[PDB]
Design an enzyme around this catalytic site. Sequence first.
Site, PDB file in Angstrom:
ATOM      1  N   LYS A  13      30.275-110.609 -81.672  1.00  0.00           N
ATOM      2  CA  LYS A  13      30.235-110.050 -80.324  1.00  0.00           C
ATOM      3  C   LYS A  13      29.782-110.749 -78.983  1.00  0.00           C
ATOM      4  CE  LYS A  13      28.390-106.416 -82.246  1.00  0.00           C
ATOM      5  NZ  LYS A  13      27.994-107.251 -83.499  1.00  0.00           N
ATOM      6  N   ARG A  88      24.983 -97.681 -80.283  1.00  0.00           N
ATOM      7  CA  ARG A  88      24.594 -97.920 -81.954  1.00  0.00           C
ATOM      8  C   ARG A  88      24.680 -97.043 -82.646  1.00  0.00           C
ATOM      9  NH1 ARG A  88      22.697-103.626 -81.734  1.00  0.00           N
ATOM     10  NH2 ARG A  88      22.479-104.390 -83.927  1.00  0.00           N
ATOM     11  N   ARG A 167      19.812-105.295 -91.974  1.00  0.00           N
ATOM     12  CA  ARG A 167      20.493-104.741 -90.654  1.00  0.00           C
ATOM     13  C   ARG A 167      22.063-104.511 -91.140  1.00  0.00           C
ATOM     14  NH1 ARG A 167      20.962-108.709 -86.825  1.00  0.00           N
ATOM     15  NH2 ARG A 167      19.669-110.541 -87.682  1.00  0.00           N
TER      16      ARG A 167
END
Length: 214
Positions: A13, A88, A167
């Site tokens: 991204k 998010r 993550r």
Amino acid sequence: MRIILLGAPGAGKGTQAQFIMEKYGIPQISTGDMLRAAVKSGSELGKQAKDIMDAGKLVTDELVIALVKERIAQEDCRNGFLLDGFPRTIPQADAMKEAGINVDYVLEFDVPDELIVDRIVGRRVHAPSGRVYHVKFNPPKVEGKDDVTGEELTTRKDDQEETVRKRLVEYHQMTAPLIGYYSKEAEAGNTKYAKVDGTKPVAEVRADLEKILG
Ligand SMILES: Nc1ncnc2c1ncn2[C@@H]1O[C@H](COP(=O)(O)OP(=O)(O)O)[C@@H](O)[C@H]1O
Ligand SMILES: Nc1ncnc2c1ncn2[C@@H]1O[C@H](COP(=O)(O)OP(=O)(O)O)[C@@H](O)[C@H]1O
Ligand code: NA
């Protein structure tokens, strides 16, 4: 034009955000970059993120919503903007809805989980700009140097394998639901949605995104 990029950590991204900023003249709004800069500078809004990012966990919704509200009020966002790392979670996306922040494209970068660790452990960053490189897959022209400024690249403190694994778990639990969120918005006619194969070479992903953005 307003664009959201979605995808796992390491999907590409930030790499692609740079091209979209350059070709369409809109700023990239990266909550990761803003948080890292706030830690580096000791800024009252965001310095609190240091230990959370180190743990591989998401920062609270309220902190990043405030960072984004502050950033998007600025003049350079008048003509549009690209969101890279935000929203998010579903409450972050609902905060945008409640603020009336409509978007034109939501672009999902698909990459198998098994590629993520070896991408992130090779990642090198130019912190002032957000430009990113990879020592094997997308190296700078001169080793350890930003192509644009010539300044020395750095390694993020949260990019070791074990932190990446954490993550990715967080992403699957808290962030992957945004795919359905924005697919539903697109079906209502409130945005376009497109998924790209993030495993292709950098220049081919860039070309696929250009085909979509026109
Ligand atoms: N298409 C690609 N193929 C191989 N490596 C890539 C590709 N796109 C980005 N990378 C590299 O993978 C790492 C992760 O990309 P990045 O853009 O930082 O991902 P994100 O912002 O989605 O976390 C970086 O080191 C980057 O140079
Ligand atoms: N919108 C957000 N909400 C919560 N935490 C965030 C947000 N954006 C960034 N972060 C924090 O910053 C870290 C790094 O995110 P980011 O720079 O987007 O990295 P990556 O591209 O590897 O996911 C996250 O693990 C999290 O701690
Ligand atoms: Na829209």
